[PDB]
Write a protein that binds this ligand. Structure first.
Ligand SMILES: CC(=O)c1nc(NC(=O)[C@@H](C)N)sc1-c1cccc(N)c1
Length: 130
């Protein structure tokens, strides 16, 4: 219905705003664009499902997220990919892992503070009805 399309449009506006706030944070610059195989050849051999904040924005605009949980699964994938690709004790690895955990914690904290729980529940119930 039109009432349901209005709900999903509000969800997309909310998700674009969260993603923008993550993408302008200097700590998260390494997560803003797809990893370039020219700059990192070994990446596609370790990471089977790449994800980044620019790809998240594209998926919002393709109506791929109908619930906040679907969105957080891709935020969680950005983080888990970084942890898997950077497992070593070296300072370069530890720095990326710290930033990845901060990206995940920041996204969850914004949603916990700013998303109405009844709004997320409505999105879930519309989705389960389709
Ligand atoms: C996001 C990620 O997993 C990632 N990990 C790196 N690890 C390392 O450089 C070594 C030291 N552990 S670099 C890097 C990355 C990816 C895209 C762009 C830029 N600037 C960095």
């Amino acid at each position: 219905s039109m009432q349901e399309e209005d709900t999903f449009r509000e969800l997309r506006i909310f998700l674009r705003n969260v993603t923008h706030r993550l993408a302008i944070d200097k700590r998260f610059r390494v997560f803003t664009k797809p990893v370039d195989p020219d700059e990192v050849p070994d990446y596609v051999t370790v990471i089977k499902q790449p994800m980044d904040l620019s790809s998240v924005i594209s998926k919002i605009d393709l109506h791929k997220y109908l619930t906040v949980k679907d969105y957080l699964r891709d935020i969680d994938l950005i983080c888990s990919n970084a942890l898997e690709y950077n497992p070593d004790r070296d300072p370069g690895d530890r720095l990326i892992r710290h930033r990845a955990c901060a990206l995940r914690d920041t996204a969850y904290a914004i949603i916990k503070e700013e998303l109405d729980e009844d709004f997320e529940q409505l999105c879930e119930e519309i989705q389960e009805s389709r």
